Write a protein that binds this ligand. Structure first.
Ligand SMILES: CC(=O)N[C@@H]1[C@@H](O[C@@H]2O[C@H](CO)[C@H](O)[C@H](O)[C@H]2O)[C@H](O)[C@@H](CO)O[C@@H]1O
Ligand SMILES: [Ca+2]
Ligand code: NA
Ligand code: NA
Length: 407
């Protein structure tokens, strides 16, 4: 009867998840009609509607997308406050969303403005770090490095066999990379200082070491085809180098299995997962808790019906549908009885001296002509191409961060 418009980003977990979730919600609430749209370019799909005033009612699109639409709408104050959804009952169950959510998932990612208001409800619960061919390392006797000195020495040995040490799909995948690396060096509070634009945080030795370590990685041990493929159309080709054995490591999450399931691979390939190495021996290594976001535009016409469907996305019925391709909703018990192909990822949490890290940059203030994500993530391509020095990389980060601190 009543029509709801839902637009969901199609990623490594696939688009058939939302087709099956929408149909299940329409089975529970037959008076609700959901016009589902899935696309790998959500902004280009819904922009004609937003330009014509026909906004979607609910959008699944986490931060760090290629278009940056979620961050743009947060800057423009165009995303509805959905704090009340936490206290809403999940359709078909006798519990609230806040009761089912895992502890600590509400933070700077879900509350980008820094307060207790939730604007981006957490989607998925994927650990992020480095993925590799477990078989290739074992056949060459190469142990998984825990430090970057072991990492660079491994890159020297791999190049003698025609293998580059490092690659990445797009430069945006350094969000989880730096989240772990910054917490590896400076610690928990230091990472929060970076996300909250603490004064002169990028002039600290901890922040300089994270950039210098990433500098040597992308200027010497990078696959020569990485930058040329670091786009929305060719990012799977950089990931394909891992399956072909031409690259050893790349930063990614649990969606990589279903995303590359039909791709060719070296004989006996097996997915390996590990946290991002730290700098010091025996130091704590962090695993990034990568979540996406579901939200409601401020210009949506059917906000109440979208809130009830958003609460349904945390039901057990929707969780079982999402988990078929590796998408683990951030609800309790969802890491129990995990699929076999997810075990190699979540078992990394059981390693010694390994903690979790989560969050993104604070959207509490905006400065004209400055994006801190471009100066840290997107700048990796310029650094790898040789157009940006280590000092220039650090100076622009400090200038933009301190400018956001004063705003
Ligand atoms: C190129 C692309 O769209 N890849 C998506 C991926 O989005 C990327 O996620 C990483 C996370 O480290 C980073 O934020 C990057 O900027 C994003 O483009 C999705 O996370 C997954 C799962 O939805 O599907 C694709 O791989
Ligand atoms: Ca120091
Ligand atoms: Na997962
Ligand atoms: Na999977």
């Amino acid at each position: 009867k009543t029509t709801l418009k839902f637009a969901a980003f199609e990623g490594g977990y696939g688009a058939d998840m939302y087709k099956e979730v929408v149909a299940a919600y329409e089975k529970l609430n037959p008076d609700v009609k959901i016009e589902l749209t899935t696309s790998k370019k959500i902004e280009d799909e819904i922009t004609p509607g937003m330009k014509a005033g026909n906004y979607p009612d609910i959008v699944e699109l986490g931060q760090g997308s290629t278009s940056g639409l979620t961050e743009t709408l947060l800057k423009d104050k165009a995303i509805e406050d959905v704090t009340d959804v936490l206290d809403m009952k999940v359709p078909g169950e006798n519990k609230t969303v806040k009761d089912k959510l895992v502890d600590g998932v509400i933070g700077l990612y879900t509350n980008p403005y820094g307060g207790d208001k939730t604007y981006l409800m957490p989607m998925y619960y994927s650990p992020s770090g480095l993925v590799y061919n477990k078989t290739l390392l074992e056949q060459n006797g190469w142990k998984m490095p825990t430090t970057w000195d072991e990492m660079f020495k491994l890159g020297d040995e791999a190049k003698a066999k025609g293998i580059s040490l490092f690659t990445y799909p797009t430069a945006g995948y350094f969000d989880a990379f730096f989240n772990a690396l910054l917490a590896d060096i400076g610690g928990d509070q230091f990472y929060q200082d970076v996300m909250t634009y603490k004064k002169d945080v990028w002039k600290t030795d901890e922040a300089k070491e994270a950039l210098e370590t990433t500098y040597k990685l992308v200027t010497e041990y990078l696959n020569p085809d990485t930058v040329g493929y670091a786009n929305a159309q060719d990012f799977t080709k950089n990931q394909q180098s891992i399956l072909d054995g031409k690259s050893l490591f790349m930063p990614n999450g649990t969606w990589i299995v279903n995303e590359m399931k039909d791709a060719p691979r070296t004989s006996g390939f097996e997915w390996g997962f590990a946290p991002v190495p730290t700098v010091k021996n025996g130091g704590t290594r962090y695993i990034n808790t990568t979540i996406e976001a579901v939200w409601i535009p401020a210009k949506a016409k059917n906000k109440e019906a979208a809130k009830k469907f958003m609460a349904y996305l945390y039901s057990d019925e929707a969780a079982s549908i999402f988990a078929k391709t590796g998408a683990i909703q951030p609800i309790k018990g969802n890491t129990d009885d995990l699929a076999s192909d997810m075990k190699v990822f979540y078992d990394a949490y059981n390693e010694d001296n390994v903690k979790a890290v989560a969050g993104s940059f604070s959207a509490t203030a905006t400065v004209e002509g400055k994006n801190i994500k471009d100066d840290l993530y997107n700048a990796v391509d310029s650094v790898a191409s040789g157009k940006t020095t280590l000092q220039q990389w650090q100076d622009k980060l400090n200038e933009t961060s301190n400018a956001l601190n004063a705003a």
